[PDB]
Design a protein around this ligand. Structure first.
Ligand SMILES: *C(=O)CCC(=O)N/N=C/c1ccc(C(=O)O)cc1
Length: 101
């Protein structure tokens, strides 16, 4: 609008179940910190394997990670989030947000 940006924020919470011999099918990457609509979390999905577990559940490149297995990760560093995901083994429940104009 004439007074500032307009955009849509879409929240997605998904349950990922994978087999032992595969990954969840995404690459996590990290971008004193206050979340903003243009920068809602420290970790985001740099890529998502088309047809992989995460893709089939509805996760997409560019999604920002808000929660992992009931723990908020908005302000959590990359290595700690990786450990939280691995702690769940073949199960990952994650909330993400995707921002678009
Ligand atoms: C995890 O594998 C996601 C991809 C990723 O994190 N790649 N990291 C690249 C990188 C790390 C450090 C430096 C540097 O010190 O200049 C450059 C690039």
């Amino acid at each position: 609008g004439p007074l500032g940006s307009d955009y849509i924020i879409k929240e997605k919470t998904v349950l990922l179940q994978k087999k032992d011999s595969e990954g969840f099918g995404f690459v996590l990457r990290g971008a004193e910190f206050t979340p903003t609509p243009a920068f809602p979390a420290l970790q985001y999905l740099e890529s998502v394997d088309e047809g992989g577990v995460a893709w089939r559940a509805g996760l997409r490149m560019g999604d920002f990670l808000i929660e992992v297995n009931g723990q908020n990760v908005v302000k959590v560093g990359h290595r700690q989030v990786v450990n939280m995901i691995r702690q769940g083994g073949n199960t990952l429940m994650v909330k993400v947000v995707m921002v678009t104009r």
